[PDB]
Design an enzyme around this catalytic site. Structure first.
Site, short mmCIF file in Angstrom:
data_model
loop_
_atom_site.label_atom_id
_atom_site.label_comp_id
_atom_site.label_asym_id
_atom_site.label_seq_id
_atom_site.Cartn_x
_atom_site.Cartn_y
_atom_site.Cartn_z
N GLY A 25 46.03 30.84 22.06
CA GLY A 25 47.35 31.44 21.95
C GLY A 25 48.43 30.38 21.87
N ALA A 28 56.43 29.64 23.36
CA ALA A 28 57.63 28.82 23.20
C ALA A 28 57.52 27.51 23.97
CB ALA A 28 58.86 29.60 23.64
N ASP A 144 59.11 38.82 36.78
CA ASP A 144 58.84 39.30 35.43
C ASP A 144 57.35 39.63 35.28
OD1 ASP A 144 59.81 39.95 32.78
OD2 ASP A 144 58.79 38.14 32.06
#
Length: 329
Positions: A25, A28, A144
């Site tokens: 994968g 950023a 998050d």
């Protein structure tokens, strides 16, 4: 008439111990490859940080990620097996790599690929809560938590990813959407509830277009909070907004989660309440009879001192402190 070509040709430099690099994968802040640890034979994931010293903000985030990963030592929390840099000295230091245990997939893809019955859901939420209890005991809030941040391997073992470094808001607590109060650890609990609900019904519980639509969908289920809670809010905009909302009654979770056991409904009712102070903690949720069948679930972990992260540094100083962290492994 055509020809095939590799277009993203990034170059890696890794210890000879790790063999068989294969991409998994991107992101950023770095890219991940699978590999085999020649010594033990175990499967590992190697993350190359993406230009960690291109800016002082990227350097600060890379340093904080490294220290958070070094601090946590729990089976349900992603940890570091190794950290290394191919550079020979500080003046050449530009890239470093993190080594973690390899998890085949994350819970997000798994929800669309695999049947999740009562036992697997119980075990996965169990591991989520144990990892969260460890994290919260260290004084860290994930903030998050989402299915994409929960890695799962072939043995249904779960590890939390990307914690403390705070798709986007279907799992966010209502105090995070409006920023109406100081964040506590129980924000993560809210996320678990959402995830757990989605694991049971297969549908996103609170799926809103805009932020206020997220709160509309939440309060359709939870109902409007009492006025006293509105008066304890810090934000003035949120206070005025909650004042003018029409009264809404709490919907029965059994009617919402039609295919949930009574114990699951009970635990979710104690997890998905608007007032964060009324939410169960990770430990209290683990003590719920829904987890009675599983082996018993405080961690003795040092409080995480974030002062070292908040020291104002130039990029050269960030590179030196990160280099010391890398070499100290």
């Amino acid at each position: 008439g055509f020809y095939r070509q590799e277009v993203t040709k990034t170059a890696w430099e890794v210890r000879a111990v790790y063999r068989d690099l294969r991409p998994v994968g991107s992101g950023a802040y770095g890219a991940v490859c699978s590999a085999v640890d020649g010594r033990t034979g175990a499967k590992v994931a190697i993350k190359k940080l993406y230009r960690p010293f291109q800016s002082e903000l990227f350097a600060k985030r890379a340093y904080r990620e490294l220290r958070l990963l070094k601090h946590m030592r729990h089976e349900n929390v992603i940890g570091l097996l190794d950290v290394f840099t191919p550079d020979e000295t500080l003046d050449d230091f530009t890239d470093f790599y993190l080594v973690m245990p390899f998890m085949g997939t994350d819970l997000g893809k798994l929800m669309k690929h695999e049947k999740l019955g009562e036992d697997r859901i119980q075990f996965l939420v169990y591991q989520m809560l144990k990892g969260l209890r460890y994290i919260h005991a260290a004084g860290i809030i994930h903030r998050d938590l989402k299915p994409g941040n929960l890695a799962v391997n072939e043995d249904c073992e779960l590890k939390i990813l990307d914690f403390g470094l705070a798709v986007t808001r279907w799992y966010r607590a209502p105090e995070v959407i409006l920023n109406w109060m100081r964040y506590t650890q129980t924000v993560d609990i809210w996320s678990v509830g959402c995830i757990m609900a989605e694991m049971i019904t297969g549908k996103t519980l609170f799926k809103g277009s805009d932020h206020l639509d997220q709160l509309k969908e939440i309060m359709k289920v939870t109902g409007t909070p009492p006025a006293e809670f509105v008066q304890r809010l810090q934000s003035d905009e949120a206070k005025n907004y909650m004042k003018g909302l029409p009264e809404l009654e709490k919907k029965d979770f059994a009617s919402i989660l039609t295919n949930a056991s009574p114990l699951a409904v009970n635990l979710l009712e104690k997890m998905l309440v608007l007032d964060a102070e009324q939410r169960v903690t990770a430990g209290e949720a683990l003590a719920h009879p829904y987890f009675e069948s599983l082996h018993d679930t405080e961690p003795q972990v040092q409080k995480y001192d974030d002062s070292f992260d908040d020291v104002d540094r130039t990029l050269d100083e960030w590179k030196r402190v990160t280099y010391k962290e890398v070499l100290s492994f």
